[PDB]
Every structure is written in structure tokens, then in C-alpha cells.
Ligand binder design. Structure first.
Ligand code: CL
Ligand code: CL
Ligand code: CL
Ligand code: CL
Ligand code: CL
Ligand code: CL
Ligand code: CL
Lengths: 116, 118
């Protein structure tokens, strides 16, 4: 009569991206509180996490409709204004593109930090 | 220029709070849903709809995005998910929220041991 096994989607996706890039819990805690650094082990994790959610493609191009789709109706205009300052992405590789995007988001709206 | 601690906002926590509030959903109901026990009541089913839409898993016309959904599921569960989504999509029901109820019941009948929480 058993209850199902309950899979925490987010924790699965985070887990899989960590083990792929050698990312430590410490590093993801740093990102979770707004501290960014341009180190592949953590920045490729950020690229990986976004990709898992279809927010980016295999080149770290942002899907704007899906990214705006993460946020409530009340924040759409602020997000679009940040997206007009930070997109299209750019950098040396997929990981660096996401570092530069995360840094561009932080300085454009420094008072809030949005995490998955 | 100079770094200041930002107010940190957990999107998933915020989504749950807004959907709860928008659909008159109690905490007890949310807990039932996270264990996989469902009722065909709007305060539950529209809450599920609201959570899914917040991740572009569905649109605002009860159309589900299979590619997005597959991207979130664990590697354990890819072959099974494609088989279950093959049987359960496209969605079907009397209204937006009921469509998601039928999809949830379809998933459960087809894979009784698997359930997902956001
Ligand atoms: Cl590194
Ligand atoms: Cl882009
Ligand atoms: Cl960028
Ligand atoms: Cl570039
Ligand atoms: Cl992030
Ligand atoms: Cl559908
Ligand atoms: Cl309808």
C-alpha cells in the first residue's frame, strides 16, 4: 500500500550539476548569498543549473521568455530592464558567460539576490 | 560599486507563498500534495498548476512543455518519464486546474512509486 518515493527536483538537479563539476557545498552557499567569483568549478555549476531549467542553451544564450517566466508578474519590468542591460551573454566559454551574467545582474539590482 | 549584502530571495519559497495565497491553499493541503495525496479541489489543483507554471512547465492554457519537464527530472528517471508522459500528454480535463489533476493522477496510476516535489 506504499507511498511513493518523493524526488526533490531541485535537489536532484543541484546534486547532478555539483558532481559533474566538482563543486562543493561551501561554494554553492557563497553563491546563494551573492558572493561571486570567476572560478569554473562554481561558475560551470551555475551554467549547469540554468541549463537544467532550460534558461540557457548549449551556448549559454538566455531564453528570455523562460527566464522572465521564473518571476512573478510584479517583477517583470525590473527583470526586463536588467535583461536589457545584461543580454545577450558574452565571455570566453559557457561558464564565464554565466559568471559575467550573474555579476551583471548583481550590480544592476544590488539590493536583491534571486536564487533557485 | 562597493558590495553590500543583498536581501536574498529563494524563488521556490516565494513561488509557494504566492501560489498558496492566490489559491486559498492551507499548509496541511500542501503537505498532503508533497506526499502525493491529491483531491480534485481548486485550492489544491490550481496550487499545483501555479507551481508548475512558475517554472514554465505549463503555459497559461494547460499546455505542458515536455522538453522543459524532462530537463528537470533526475537521470534515474528519464526512460520511465518519457514513457509516462507518452501516455499522459497532452493534458485533458474540464478546466485548466482539472487538467493538471488528471495529469497528476495519470502519473500516479502509471508510476505509483514515483512522485515529485518542487
Ligand atoms: Cl575552479
Ligand atoms: Cl543571451
Ligand atoms: Cl554574460
Ligand atoms: Cl561571447
Ligand atoms: Cl543563480
Ligand atoms: Cl499538454
Ligand atoms: Cl477550459
Amino acid at each position: 500500500w506504499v507511498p511513493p518515493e518523493v524526488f526533490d527536483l531541485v535537489a536532484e538537479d543541484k546534486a547532478r550539476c555539483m558532481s559533474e563539476h566538482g563543486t562543493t557545498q561551501a561554494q554553492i552557499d557563497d553563491v546563494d548569498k551573492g558572493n561571486l567569483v570567476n572560478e569554473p568549478s562554481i561558475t560551470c555549476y551555475m551554467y549547469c543549473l540554468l541549463e537544467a531549467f532550460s534558461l540557457v542553451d548549449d551556448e549559454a544564450n538566455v531564453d528570455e521568455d523562460i527566464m522572465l517566466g521564473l518571476l512573478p508578474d510584479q517583477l517583470q519590468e525590473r527583470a526586463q530592464s536588467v535583461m536589457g542591460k545584461c543580454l545577450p551573454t558574452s565571455g570566453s566559454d559557457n561558464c564565464n558567460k554565466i559568471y559575467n551574467l550573474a555579476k551583471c545582474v548583481q550590480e544592476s539590482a544590488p539590493d536583491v539576490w534571486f536564487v533557485i
